[model samples]
Target: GGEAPNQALLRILKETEFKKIKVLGSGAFGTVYKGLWIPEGEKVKIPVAIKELREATSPKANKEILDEAYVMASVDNPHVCRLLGICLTSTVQLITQLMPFGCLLDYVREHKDNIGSQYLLNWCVQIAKGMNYLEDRRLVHRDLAARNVLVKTPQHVKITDFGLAKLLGAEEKEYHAEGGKVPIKWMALESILHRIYTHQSDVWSYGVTVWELMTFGSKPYDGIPASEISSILEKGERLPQPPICTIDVYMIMVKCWMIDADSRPKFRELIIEFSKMARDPQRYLVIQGDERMHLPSPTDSNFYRALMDEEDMDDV
Candidate 1:
């Protein structure tokens, strides 16, 4: 093969630059090794998450992973996971910022008993800000879920794992896959039916994520079967508002799950709404709400769940 400029364009890092301390999580993305990254000739060091993909080591798979990392490296935002470099060793390693607080799923579940409404709403704003950045950059984080979000600090959360393709510097604005079980639970009507993903579809995913935050980390449609989600929605059932979810906040999510994709509110508007709540904490301190919407409420199961959680299944 001819020399790939991508090898030079992206940092050709070595394994020595990083030191693994613990295994964070492992799945289709391969395994995440939480470690320390010390750049060469620099005294400064920081904790980082190194991802080693599960793909075959053939040249085809290697090139694909690098290209994905290149797209992610171009994305730089405090609220978005940044791919700092590729550790070019025997096996490719993706070096990304290590979120010390861990995934938003576990963090909320741990603090669900004590976290405040204003505090949770702030996270909604942070996520919206990140999505708005992607929204502005013409990038579609095909997979947007609470489990894919990591807590950077008590005051911040960063969006991670864009799933399949991120539309950037590419003409395709939507993603469609032919076969395999999709993450039907969080998807919009158009996406669920046609396997189509648009910016609005991501908005639909965000609604369920916000619901997760509000409900304190419960599974989406816990008892429902994935294959039956489309029929369930067709019958006019949607995720119901949690007891702790506020009206104004839940109303924004309602717009996100609209039957028509275009009717969903954009991330720009979501940021504005959540930002409003940030300004008036006293008004949104809904420790609990008075009524619940006539929607499907999942059982009291904890943690994010999906029929399919791997990008390979959604590989486009």
Candidate 2:
């Protein structure tokens, strides 16, 4: 379930070694701070993101924290965030590579006008490739939305936030959650109705994320409120294709949203599709102008932060 961190990365980091600069993000599980990590032997400190567990020290809470670290450590991919190390002294802290560009949601929204279609397609491919890697490892990232993805640079995106990830045994294909607050807007119909999570459900969320990216972080199901989302999907109505989304790309999304999980394309298949799209010259022609709306400004709405800060409670 895990890989030992490099010996060089293994050090008893003192509280004094990390200087918290600012809050990068937070959720039910903990708060992530933008911090500087100064190792004992190094003179220059490196920028890093530190996730501090909010709960009191306990066997269950510590296990959960270690579970997330194990998941991150087990997966090796360029598009997946790297877990540098963990501190287990007075508090549980996860040290991770600091993503300078912030989340993909914010990056896309801010750069939509300045970036071209090829750029968007490239990111879409990168995410699919990342998910494909996780899929190959029998891991289901229960939270695979745009906000869960971190943008490392203008050219790259990496999947992060493994708190809700589940590892599937060889024979197990679906995980049943008794109860939890599901992301209504991004979930598959079966997932929302029955709490049955599978790799395909992640595919559904990925499709919604693609829509978010295509529209530059606009809220999904914009006209319909969250409470009514289930009824709308029950009626067999899916999210309308983003105006800027190409027919081919939107069609791929439609495949992801199939009501039957068996009918949905796997993440590997999505990688192939996006890879082809990334190479297509026509993909760059589907750009829409400023008519598309951005998410409501943060000062006016907490919803923006809510999307970024998904609760990490165990789906029990």
Q: Count the backbone clashes (under 3 Å) in each candidate.
A: 0, 1
Q: Give one digit per residue, the lDDT tens place, for model 1 in 105-181.
A: 88889866667766787899999999888877677777788998988666778898755655644566677778665
Local accuracy of candidate 2 as per-residue lDDT tens digits, 1-316: 4443432323336777777888977877678898776666645555679988777556777788888888887777889987777887666888887777788888878777766676777788899999989888888998999889987667778999897898887778888887767678999888888888988899999999988888888998777778898888888898778777767888888898888888999888888878777787354437655225232222322311222221111111
Best by lDDT: 2
Candidate 1 ranges with C-alpha deviation above 4 Å = 1-9, 54-64, 168-173, 288-316
TM-score of 2: 0.82
Model 1 TM-score relative to the real fold: 0.83
Clashing residue pairs in candidate 2 are: 179-316
Candidate 1 global CA lDDT score: 0.76
* Segments in model 2 whose C-alpha atoms lie over 4 Å from true places: 1-17, 26-29, 42-45, 55-63, 281-285, 288-316
Error of 1 at 223 (Å): 1.0
| TM-score, one value per model | 0.83, 0.82
